[PDB]
Design a protein around this ligand. Structure first.
Ligand SMILES: Cc1cc2nc3c(=O)[nH]c(=O)nc-3n(C[C@H](O)[C@H](O)[C@H](O)COP(=O)(O)OP(=O)(O)OC[C@H]3O[C@@H](n4cnc5c(N)ncnc54)[C@H](O)[C@@H]3O)c2cc1C
Ligand SMILES: Cc1cc2nc3c(=O)[nH]c(=O)nc-3n(C[C@H](O)[C@H](O)[C@H](O)COP(=O)(O)OP(=O)(O)OC[C@H]3O[C@@H](n4cnc5c(N)ncnc54)[C@H](O)[C@@H]3O)c2cc1C
Lengths: 471, 472
């Protein structure tokens, strides 16, 4: 029987960071993880392996395609060694998951391997695989149990030929033809990986836009345009009625228009299902505690991330807000800081989103659609990467930066980046929004030349002064 | 016949052309004078743009020709360098961007005058064309943006064949087997790295004891040198060049000594690149008749409004004090012109970043540890290595670190130093933080997207403020 001040259930970005932070704050901290490794979804089957394949497949596309030839880099034959590519991804995951174990040891966090159940208001019971149980008597419980793939009814995932994101990250061979259910962030990234590697990729989406929820519509349409020129095909406003395996091993996917009619069937070697991810709370003990989930399966919490039970907290994918790794990390920190008497506030408006395709997509703050719905009057500033010096020097000119500013105060309300380096660039925008910078304020910052970030500067100038220098 | 203007800009580099565009946008009637055949000055034509083009392309060549692509499962039977085609890509970018300036001048109603400009009167500039024809401008204000030129090495004459300046090095016809670079500054290191990647055997000779030029943090410089040496870049620091001689075979013998004395030796090369610095260009501008005298280094003295001794004659960019960088020249051009219209004029050179576009990149803004010690400012240090950053590790691109210097009592960020991937873009987040007096804690509380290289910048600030980072 272990006693601790804070017991964290889950070792994903929210849990493992929260556990480290609590230990650094003087709490006696225990972290419970059922899986064989730490790091949760993001490290093991999420951010890390997908970004590795996006990076590796992009370079393959550059070598196999015309890009390197245009720069005087001539290759007689370019062939794909998928095993070695997957090996590079695996090397990264193992290095990072091992790093978490090193960090837990460094900060005196106690790692418990088992399935954690809340058996008492102050106790958690961890059941090991052999059946052995470890009991933790604890002042505070931090729930960071995360998410799972949302199943598609009538379509059964076998991680062989009908795959979730996990299976798509480890295909043993490039499928000749692949269908993706869901054109959200995960679907678009994974389809693009396999599309670059030679697969014929179609993504089927019930909604009318690509990129998931909260993405600016102009950005979404331009993003789709570029992806379509790459060879990514889209069926939007389209419903999937069912999928059936066949004797030949191919899969027939039956679809219909979302409004109705237009029945059709399409075939593939691999079907990837990414209609979403949902909060995971099974066999946690919430049933007995009287903690009621919201209709979407998330745990309700107050501003301090407290459940109705004051000493039981929840953070990350399991609660409301964007289901992102950096969001879960910050919630874990402020929640644990709140346990130490700190004030707790987060504005999900300042949580950025990134799509690691090429071109990348990144945004923070509000979209034009959000501003119109909230009745806020704004002005628009745009700068295309075709006019950016570094993008032109790199011969990589897709996309633009779009800035939304408050009409009178010039305050930056949203930043949307479609093009090279969007993922890193959005962090400059994030720093600006957190402290309420104006468009003029960013325009007056001396940005290094030549850098992609100058497109961000000039877009802010356009929103503020009405005109850019280089466009 | 003679032209009248509110603003006459001499020079079309980043300082001049941006200032001319801004002056027109403020309602001034603007004329821009350029002696060269194309607009854009040093940066576009023989500076930032072509060097960044070759750095980008030679870096990709290195990844394909070397082991990087193989480690990712991108297998190629043979990788060959088509130098002519690579130089073609560089030339195409320069052509598109210099032409783009012409469109912007046309878009903003700036009058483009092609000729050599001399200040013939307090309110008059005379442009002398190659044919000998002159066009005269009577103007209320004169903005000098005449830029810089290569600093020559006395006794070693550049012919842009085997003894080259940065200009010659950017257009070599073949990869030299052996190359010597005089000067380990930003330009020397970038160009030496390009040819080293393309197969040349490269040595850089530097009179000073560190690489990367002045203002670079010494710890960053030493780590940068260490990494470049593992790439194959060779350095001889604290080393003086006594002379260089061409040889009958066409090779070059470079005679060197330790700066303190002794260790005399000779090293031979196919190409010698002379990169000891750049200096202000004011030739035949008419300053002496106006009584405008240069400082010892050849720069035009100006006040905080960029005014010369003659209040209606201004100077900006490489010809004046401050870092000789393009974004510096652009900002000075905008605020100077804004000042002509009665606007406030202020720039903080401490908030001007510097970037080295090698791989890994080097970028910094604010103060170095050496500067803080010299100024007597007490600081605390926070560091985070890219080996611990998720995106860098995912990319298998893990060299370097982020170093943050914070004031001990106020927690104010005094300097940000980045050695590693994406440093050039990242420093712009740092510049935004310094310009508005952010603290280390302030940056640490910003939600940075995961996984990004910028998370290293957040964690380094957390380390400086709180004493510890999350992931290291
Ligand atoms: C393919 C893919 C790519 C992604 N890419 C990105 C990206 O680029 N950027 C981004 O921000 N997000 C990305 N995400 C999302 C990101 O992974 C999640 O938002 C994040 O992992 C959520 O963190 P969490 O700690 O809340 O949950 P999780 O990471 O799911 O952690 C939950 C952990 O708790 C454990 N656990 C659960 N219940 C129990 C229990 N009862 N007892 C014991 N242990 C338990 C689980 O085994 C798991 O290890 C991606 C997701 C996927 C699938
Ligand atoms: C190889 C190299 C790489 C560089 N890389 C970078 C980099 O990555 N980033 C960076 O910030 N900086 C870089 N620089 C420096 C950058 O080029 C300068 O800081 C910038 O060009 C300065 O702009 P300017 O307008 O002050 O001067 P210039 O660019 O030199 O412009 C001066 C112009 O005025 C013209 N002129 C001069 N005298 C007269 C006259 N009497 N009449 C008419 N016209 C005249 C010249 O012909 C020229 O076009 C690099 C420089 C070199 C050489």
């Amino acid at each position: 029987p272990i006693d601790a001040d804070v017991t964290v259930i889950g070792s994903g970005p929210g849990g493992y960071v929260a556990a480290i932070k609590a230990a650094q704050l003087g709490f006696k901290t225990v972290c419970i993880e059922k899986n064989e490794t730490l790091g949760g979804t993001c490290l093991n089957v999420g951010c890390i392996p997908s970004k590795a394949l996006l990076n590796n497949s992009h370079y393959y596309h550059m070598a196999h395609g015309k890009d390197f030839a245009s720069r005087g880099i001539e290759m007689s034959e370019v062939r794909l060694n998928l095993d070695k590519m997957m090996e590079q991804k695996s090397t990264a995951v193992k290095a990072l998951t091992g790093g978490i174990a090193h960090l837990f040891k460094q900060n005196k966090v106690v790692h418990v391997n088992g399935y954690g159940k809340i058996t008492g208001k102050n106790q958690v019971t961890a059941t090991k695989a052999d059946g052995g149980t470890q009991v933790i008597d604890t002042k505070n419980i931090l729930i960071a149990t995360g998410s799972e793939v949302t199943p598609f009814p009538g379509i059964t995932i076998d991680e062989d030929t009908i795959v979730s994101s996990t299976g798509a990250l480890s295909l043993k061979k490039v499928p000749e033809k692949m269908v993706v259910i869901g054109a959200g962030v995960i679907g678009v990234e994974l389809g693009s990986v396999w599309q670059r590697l030679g697969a014929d990729v179609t993504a089927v989406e019930f909604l009318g836009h690509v990129g998931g929820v909260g993405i600016d519509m102009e950005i979404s349409k331009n993003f789709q345009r570029i992806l379509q020129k790459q060879g990514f095909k889209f069926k939007l406003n389209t419903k999937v009625t069912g999928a059936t395996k066949k004797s030949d091993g191919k899969i027939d996917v039956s679809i219909e228009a979302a409004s109705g009619g237009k029945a059709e069937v399409i075939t593939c070697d691999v079907l990837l299902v990414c209609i979403g991810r949902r909060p995971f709370t099974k066999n946690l003990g919430l049933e007995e505690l009287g903690i009621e989930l919201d209709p979407r399966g998330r745990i309700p919490v107050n501003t301090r991330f407290q459940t109705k039970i004051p000493n039981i907290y929840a953070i990350g994918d399991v609660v409301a807000g964007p289901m992102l790794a950096h969001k879960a990390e910050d919630e874990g920190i402020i929640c644990v800081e709140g346990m130490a008497g700190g004030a707790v506030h987060i504005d999900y408006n300042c949580v950025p989103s990134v799509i690691y395709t090429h071109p990348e997509v990144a945004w923070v703050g509000k979209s034009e659609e959000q501003l119109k719905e909230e009745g806020i009057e704004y002005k628009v500033g745009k700068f295309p990467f075709a006019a950016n010096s570094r993008a032109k020097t790199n011969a990589d000119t897709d996309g633009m930066v779009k800035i939304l500013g408050q009409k009178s105060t010039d305050r930056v309300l949203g930043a949307h980046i479609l093009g090279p380096g969007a993922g890193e660039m959005v962090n400059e925008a994030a720093l600006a929004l957190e402290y309420g910078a104006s468009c003029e304020d960013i325009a007056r910052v001396c940005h290094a030349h030549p850098t992609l970030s100058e497109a961000f500067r000039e877009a802010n100038l356009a929103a503020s002064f009405g005109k850019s220098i280089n466009f």
